[PDB]
Each structure stands twice: as structure tokens, then as C-alpha cells.
Amino acid sequence: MSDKIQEEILGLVSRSNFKQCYAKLGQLQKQFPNALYFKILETYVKFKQSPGKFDYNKLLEEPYGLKGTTITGDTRSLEFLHNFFVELGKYDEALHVYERGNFKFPSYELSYHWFMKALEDSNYNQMSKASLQLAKYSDSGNLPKRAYYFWNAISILAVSRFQENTLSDPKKILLSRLARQSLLDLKPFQNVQEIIVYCLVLDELFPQSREISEEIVAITFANFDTSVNLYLKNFILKHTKLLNSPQKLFEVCSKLIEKGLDDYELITNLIDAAYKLSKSKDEVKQWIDENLGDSRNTRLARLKLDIMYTDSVSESSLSYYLSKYHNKPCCSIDLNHYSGHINIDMLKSIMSKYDPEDKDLIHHCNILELGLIGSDSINNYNKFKGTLEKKSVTDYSSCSTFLLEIVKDKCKKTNPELKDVLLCITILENYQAKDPHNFDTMCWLIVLYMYLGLVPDAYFHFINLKIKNVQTDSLDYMIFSRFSTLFPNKQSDFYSKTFHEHNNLYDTSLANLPRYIQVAFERNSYSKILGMLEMRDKLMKSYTRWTKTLENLQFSRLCNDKRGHLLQKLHEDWRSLEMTQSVSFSDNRDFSILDENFAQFLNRGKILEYANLNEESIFLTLIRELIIEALPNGEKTEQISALLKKLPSINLEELLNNNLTEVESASFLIFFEIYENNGKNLHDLISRLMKVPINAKQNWMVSHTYLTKMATLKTLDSLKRIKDKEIQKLIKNSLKELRSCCDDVFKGYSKALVQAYEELKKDECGNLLKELDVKAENVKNIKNSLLGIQKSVRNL
Amino acid sequence: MTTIQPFEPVDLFKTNNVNLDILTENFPLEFYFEYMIIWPDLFFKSSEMTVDPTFKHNISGYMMAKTEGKTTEWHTHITAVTVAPRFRRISLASKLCNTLETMTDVMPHEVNFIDLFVKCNNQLAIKLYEKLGYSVYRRVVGYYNSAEDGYPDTLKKVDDNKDAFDMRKAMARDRNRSVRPDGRSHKCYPHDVRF
């Protein structure tokens, strides 16, 4: 009955029909004079009608604020107060009322409710307080009192890892002391998870403590007698090494290895401990081989023993490992880890000793990466392109290493030419026709098209990857980054289906996290909680998560779509970040999937300038979108003003150029002039925006520079506060040339590609094309894709 | 070199090097959470210390399992096994299978046997499983039937591209009670597999 009123009142509040809300609440008031929930509803309705007309301090600070005295135990009344306080950005007072409510009316239900809602706000300090209240009143609860004390420890662990800024220096020691003593009083531990939390509490809240390491080592080693646990393996390995006890390290490794754990970390620690125990090299080698047999680690343990005992890898141990793995993909990384101790010629001679029949495709790839022989990708691929027709369809071909090496070499140039970009496209497309499931070359074909702006053929690749769930956050950045200025086609499956299905991670899965968080605590899966705690934090700060919403706001603006609902979610997302008291963005993009050294390759590669997006660029784009909402009101907001100070205290012009494109930099300065300076300088500012050249060599900038101009002008047209006649003349006149040059630029872009194809057929590109045993693909197909983009751009 | 490491929930962002494989399923994000909530200890990954985490993901694979059944049916079920393309055909798939053996044969699990479902046409997996001591117990007709395919109506019709093998290994404590040499000739509906 309480809920049924809530949406009815909110629905009438939503439709701005506030008049009958008071009477119906008054009817509820006369029936329920003591129901403070209706009193909270009244203020909520009052604030919605006119936020600037009702005194927040008089009506909310004194009854319910941080000094609030009006304290009630009704869960619904407190929930609505927390909701309204969060809606006002008063997160401190939002969770303050529940602590006071639990203080005035302590109960297992109210403490449980406080724990849940504080969990939603990521206030790890509050669950530490909330869990303790549950422990005292655990008598009426469904869980043992020992569970809640661990919950306090986990919450303390939560503050230590992610909310260390919220603790004063004396408080850290007090909470550290509290965490250990609560878990000590519950000894003996009932299960593995309880042991892990105590070890987790000691490991990070008492670092570099000698007695802490010994205590953890003792208890974990005792549990190893009957059960095998990997978490305790991590605990015992780290602290025993800190103990500087080679005898204990040898015993621990020997105990776990004898139990069937084939781990190189155990082997390395066994190897390191034996040397400090002065064990002979042969004794350790036979002991490892006797207990572990012939494995990848055991063969490579001998190489580790060679470096530790002789500072150089002996030919006996290396050849033994090369006896089985010379033609394996893992040979590359294993020998590279020891490249500083291995003689290259001695390794080279062994590779030349093997039979040419054993010198298979993988063997040459291992040769090519080791630098033993000069790059012969063209011949090696030609030699091994015969493996393409005999390999399994689902199996990946290692011939990509040859072809990608050529692709990388050309792409290492700072300014790829039009023919150079097209040259790599031709090579990979034929290989991808031969190797449909090979993501290594297929990802590069994707990246090649996006730089040229050719979305439709690149999007044809994504559906074949079957990207879903976690892969959306880490791999959609090649395609959905800045999508509003590249492929603004609402009717396309690209946006209608692929984009919409990818949002389910953020709109649905992200909201479903709290339910799974609760069961983990209740099922005593405390160990996964801390890692799963990091999972949610990175999600709301994800680069892809923030980019897609802001770009969609521009895309909705570009297509004249409604933005009132869209902004509301942005404020909720912005509110969600703010209550976590850590305003930051999480770069979860997987740049390593394309190249090992992609970090060095991002900033120098113009091939990925469309994906060059940092925290400063993301934060700025949020500011521009937030200005859009505030401009029709014409009022400066403290929300925007405070964020402006958080920007670097440098010249604003230079900050844009380091994180945003030139056209975006001009457009960014456009919105500030009207917002900050009341728009006195648009006449010069708009002229500079139109003076931005649009040349056929700009590749993806051509679509970007056109649509950024298209997006910003449409905003200023729809902004009704523009009253000066003269600036109104140029804004519409500037649009005229923008509509006119819609096809002029594209046919120039279309024309420019044609000569590049002719350049490919001739000179060095043609000669290698004959060497490639690959003939140039037809021009007409990609032109239709480019003309298809021009087809959609006209209707915009 | 390969080291067996716990699979943290945030490691899902570091699994692209394994997840882009065509036969490796990227399960719904909720499904990844369910396994670690009830059975965290068996949710681990294979990592390479030779691969620097700063420049590239070092995860070579991840193993999902569960324990079901009662009394004689108490067993560990292997759900999905995957190995990164860079680390295949080097018996690392065998190591993870043996890793579940030593983990579940001792306390607190002490399971009677290990079972899993593999498609009948998956000859690559069938030879791998049978090599390590696993034995086929029954053929699950229509295990991978979609909604369009509907529920199988008869066990007489069998298709290798649709039926799955109830593909088992017996432990020492089982005394081979849960395995039989004639498991291929036994057929049952997907609903008959209840624990």
C-alpha cells in the first residue's frame, strides 16, 4: 500500500500536475497523521515544483541533515529520504539518516537495510559501521555473528584498497587494529574463506611486519596438510620469501609440488631456495623431473637452473627443451624471457640443426621472431601459404605473422600514405578470405578501414567476431569511439542493433551487480568479493561507458532526437560516480590485442588517432554536453563551475588541442563564449570554425570535420537565447555552405582514392603485388561504401 | 612458462587474447559471477610470468567447474575449458584437467568422479579426454538443441553435430562404479541428466 502511492504521486509529479498531489497526500495525511513518509513526500513534491523556492536548510537540513534530529525507523521513510538526498547530491546526509535511524531504532532489518543501501553508494566506510550493528543484533538474523565480523573486516579491506583517501592517519591504525582483533576472536576459522580474509587483513593492513608473515605462513602451511588452496599458496609464497627462509621455501614448494601442482612459480621458488640451501644443480634437476615428469616447465626449469648456476644457458638444457618445443608457438615467449642469458649463435645453430621437414610453419615463425634470420615474410608466407588450404577452418594460420610483419612495418610510419593504407588492406583481405577466423589480421583490417572512415565494410567484420558481454567494454572502442562524427546512420544495424545490444552491459548488467554482491557475502565467498569490488568501480569509470553516452548525446542532437531522458541517465551516471567520492575514468580499452608495444604505437600512429582518447578528452566532452542542458536556462551552475576548476589551471585553448581534434577545439570554445561571456565573440569564433579546411587527404577527419560542424551549428540554431540579428544571419548562412559542400567534399574524397589505387598497381607497390601472388581488388566495391556514406550524409 | 593463478573478476578485461577464439564462448556477464559466488576455489586461470602484464594480457586460459549430485552422484562437472591460441598443442590443456583432479580429490570436495559434456563430432576433444583416463558414460541426444530445433522426441535418431557425450572420468574412491566401457551404446534424453 505504501509503494502504490509512490509511483502515483511521482507520476502526477512527473506530468507537472502537482495540484491534486497535495489533496491526495492530505487525505493520506488525515488518515495517517503520524506517517512521516508522507511528510518526506510533501517536501519531495515541493522541491520538484520549484527548487529555488523552497529553503533546503529550513526543510531538510535540520530534520534530516547531518545535524538532523527527526529520526525515524521506517524503512520506506528512510529509503525515500536517502533517495531524495542522493537526488540533491547530498550523499553524506543520504546515508547519515540511516545511521541515525539505526542508532535510534536498532534492528536486524534496519541494519540490513542500511548495509544494502550503503553498498549501493560504494561508501565502504559505511558497511564497516553497518556490519557491526548487524553483529550485535545477529540474534534475530539468519547468519551467525561470526559472519558479520568478517563483513566488517571486508569493508575495512574495502576502505583500505579503494577509499584510503577517506581515512585519517590515526584512523587507519584503529581500523587495522579493529579488523585483526575481530577475526582473531572468531578463531578457529571454520573454512578456507575465513582464513583468506584474515590473511588478507594481515597482508595489506600490516605490511612489512615480521610477526605477521610468520603467523600467516604457519596457519597456511598447516592447512596444506589435508587441503590444497591456491590463495594460501599465494600467501605462503609471498611471506616465506619475506622471511628469507630458504629451508621453509624449499619445504613449502616440495610439499605443494608433491601434491600434483605443476606450477613454475613453485619451481622457481624451489629453485631459488635450493641454491641458498647449497643444493647441487643435478639434485634439484632430478627431483623436479621425478615429481613432475617431462613438462613445459620442467624443460624450461633446466634453463633457469643454467642461468642461476652458470649465468649462461647450456646447450644440453636448451636442446632438451628445444627437442620438443622448437616447433611450438610458446617457444617465442619462453626464450625471449631468457634472451639476456642465451648466446644467439648457439641457439641459431640448434635451429639450423633440425631437419627441414621439422622446419615447419611454426618453426620458421619462432625463427622469425627470435631475430635469428632476417625478415623474409614474403617468401616464408609464400612457402607456407600451402598450409592455409590444409589447415582446419576453425584453426588459425601462423602465416599472419609474416603478413602482419609487413603490415606493421608500413604502419610504423608516422604518416601513412593513401596508397600505403590501401596496400595493407589488399594484403590482409585476401588472407582473411583464406583465414576467416584469424582475429590477428582481421582486427588490422578493421583498424585500417576506420582510419579511412569506411565504416560499412569494417562493421561487416565485427559481426563475425561475435563480440559480446565483457568484450564489449574492451573491444568496442575500435568502432563506437566518436561514432557520432563517423557513421550517423540511425536506420543501420550498426546503431540500431549492434550498438543497442552492447549497451545491455551498462544499462542492465551494471544495475544487476548489487544483487550478486549481496549473495556473495551471504554465501561466504568473501575472497572473490574484493576482486569483484574492483569490477564495479572500473565499469562506471570505463572509457567506453562514458564515451558512448556522450557521443550518443551528440548523435541524438545531430539527428534532433529527444535528450531529456538521455541527460537524466547521464546525471544519474554522474551521480553514481560522485557518491563513490572518487571522480575518475578507467581506461579498460584493450590496446594490446593489436600490438605488443601498442602503448608506444598509440601516440605515434596516425592509424589510431581516431582512437587517441584519454581522461582529459573524456572529461572535456562531458563538460560540453553538460553546457548543452544549462544553455537554454542561461544560468551558470555550481555543478559545471566546480568541474571547471578541476580542469588544469592552464590556458584553456592549449588544453583542447592536446586531447581533442582541431574542429572540436574550435567547437568547444564556441559553447563557453555563450555560457561564460554571454557570446560576445561568436562572430570571430564561428568564422574560425568555418575556416577549418576540409581536404581529401584527411581520411576519417573528413567525416569528423563535416559532422562536428553539422552538430555544433544545429545546437546554436535550436538555442533560442540567440537574439542578436547579425550573428543570426551568419549562423544560417554558414549552414548553407555546409549543406552545399555535402557532395563537393565526398567526390573529392572519392576521386582521391582512385589515383591511390593506380599508384598501387605501379612502382614498388605493383612489383610487390606481383610478389605477393595477390591481385588488386576492384575499386567499385569500396567506392559504393564511400558513396553509401555520402548517401546517408545528404539526408542529415 | 605457465603458472596457475586465480581468476579475479576484473581479469575478464584481460581475456580478449583467449575470448576471441571461435569455439570459446563469452558467457553472459552474470554467468561469470555465479560460479565464483558459490564455488570460488575452483575458479582460476592460467598465467604466463614471461608475458608482462603491463604490455599484454598474460592469461592463457580459465577453467569453470561446479559440484553437483548427492551420495554416489557427488561429482565435479567441467563446464568450459579454453586455451589461448598462442599456448595450444603444448599439453597445457592436460595440465588444467589434472589441476581439477588434485584440487577436487582432496578436502573439502573429495568428489567421486569428474564429468563434462562434449559434442560428438568434436574428435579433437574426444581424443584429448580419453587420453588422460576419462571414459564416455552415455550419449546425450539433443543436449545442444536450440529453441528452433525443439526437444528431441526419440533417441533412435542420433547426430554427431547435435548430440553431446556425457564424458566422464572415475576417481579412485569411485572404484569405477560411475563409468562403464559400453557407455557409447547408452542413450538418454537431456532431462534424464539430473543430479
**Site from B11, B12, B22, B122 to mutate, A interface, most A CB atoms within 10 angstroms:** B22
Quote the distance between the C-alpha of residue A696 and its chain's center. Answer: 34
For residue A6, with 0-12 CB atoms within 10 Å meaning exposed, 13-18 middle and 19 or more buried, which class applies? middle
Contact B118, B164 (CB under 8 A): yes
Which grid cell sits at A567? 541527460
What's the rounded Cα separation, in Å, for the pair A503 and A476?
Answer: 11
What's the rounded Cα separation, in Å, for the pair A351 and A367?
Answer: 8
- Cell 572415475 found at: B170
The structure was resolved to a resolution in Å of 3.1
Contact A325, A296 (CB under 8 A): yes
Contact residues, chain B, for A470 at CB < 8 Å: 12-13, 15, 19, 26, 29, 32
Pick from B125, B138, B140: nearest CA to B82:
B125
Contact residues, chain A, for B23 at CB < 8 Å: 394
Measured in angstroms, the CA of B90 and the nearest CA of chain A are apart by: 7
A98-124 burial, b for 16+ CB within 10 Å, e for fewer?
bbbbbeeeeebebbbbbbbbbbebbbb
In terms of CA atoms, which chain B residue is nearest residue A516?
B33
- Sequence-separated (6 or more) residues with CB below 8 Å from residue A681: A673
Which DSSP string do the residues of A573-624 spell out, in sequence order?
HHHHHHTTT----B-----TTT-TTHHHHHTT-GGGGGG---HHHHHHHHHH
Contact A55, A544 (CB under 8 A): no
Nearest CB to A523 within list B38, B50, B57: B38
With CB atoms and an 8 Å threshold, state whether A330 touches B6: no
- Cell 621425478 found at: A290
Q: How many other CB atoms are there within 10 angstroms of residue A235's CB atom?
A: 25
Amino acid at A455: V
CA Rg value for chain A: 32
Output phi, psi for A59, to 5 deg: -95, -20
Contact residues, chain B, for A300 at CB < 8 Å: 1
HSE, CB side, 13 Å, CA atoms: give it for residue B110. 8
**Site from B19, B25, B26, B29 to mutate, A interface, most A CB atoms within 10 angstroms:** B29
HSE, CB side, 13 Å, CA atoms: give it for residue A569. 17
Amino acid at A82: H
With CB atoms and an 8 Å threshold, state whether A531 touches B91: no
Which grid cell sits at A674? 555563450
In terms of CA atoms, which chain B residue is nearest residue A266?
B3
With CB atoms and an 8 Å threshold, state whether B40 touches A329: no
What's the rounded Cα separation, in Å, for the pair A424 and A420?
Answer: 7
A-B CB pairs within 8 A amount to: 159
What's the rounded Cα separation, in Å, for the pair A726 and A723?
Answer: 9
With CB atoms and an 8 Å threshold, state whether A469 touches B88: no
Torsion of CA B172, B178, B179, B183, to 10 degrees: -170
Which DSSP string do the residues of A688-752 spell out, in sequence order?
HHHTS---GGGTHHHHHHHHHHHHHHHHHHH-TT---HHHHHHHHHHHHHHHHHHHHHHHHHHHH
